[PDB]
Amino acid sequence: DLTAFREHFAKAKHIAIITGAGVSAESGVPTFRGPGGFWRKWQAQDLATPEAFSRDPSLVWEFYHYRREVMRSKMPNPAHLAIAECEARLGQQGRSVVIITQNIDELHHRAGSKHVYEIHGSLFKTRCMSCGEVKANHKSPICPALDGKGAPDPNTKEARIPVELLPRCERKSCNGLLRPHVVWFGETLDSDILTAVERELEKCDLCLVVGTSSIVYPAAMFAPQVASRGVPVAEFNMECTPATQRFKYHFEGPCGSTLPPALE
């Protein structure tokens, strides 16, 4: 039921919205999971790892260079915005709204959401492997050597860039190698961030899971904490919702359609 949800939303004063890659997908962003989700000869699972990077940064950086460039044509969908706008609209009235996101494409930032938690980091942030610095980087290309590389076709020859010519630490007192400031397979999330999230969720009195479901990583680390306090949780996604055992607020179908009505 819709209007049920709407009356919590009315009453509620600290809202916490968790976004999956469903929302990213709704903006035309590729996400490399299962059914047709390859890049050249590999799936994400192969490339998004620390070893893959140690062992072939040219290639990893191609993959990531490509992902950075695709965002150039990919805009925030209506969800991304309704959120940003709702965050802003509510804040005006001293009402809190925070986004917690598995996505790394800065699309919330571009819709203009502010109190946001990028828990996998971001494509447009860099980490120096030597000194550890984290600066934002939206350069296109991030460096000359990659200029128009990273093409997605199975066949494409590898750029095969020498490491010295991959992106480096501009603080030339170091000049270390940069990597995408992204969480990879077999890497832990930032304890600092989780503490802040844990705080934020504990404060919330309405939680939204968007373009994903409560039952899978990463939503499933959080939804319990808030549900366990009796705080209502509402899914907005494409997962179908069986006969008889419908949840208290599932909102099946594309976020871009479903959510702006819900939040207005």
């Binding site: 996998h120 969480v183 990879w184 397979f185 077999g186 890497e187 832990t188 999330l189 304890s191 989780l194 990583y217 680390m221």
Partner: peptide, 8 residues
């Protein structure tokens, strides 16, 4: 620290 996808 929490692994990504709990290890998978």
């Amino acid at each position: 620290x929490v692994l990504x996808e709990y290890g998978v």
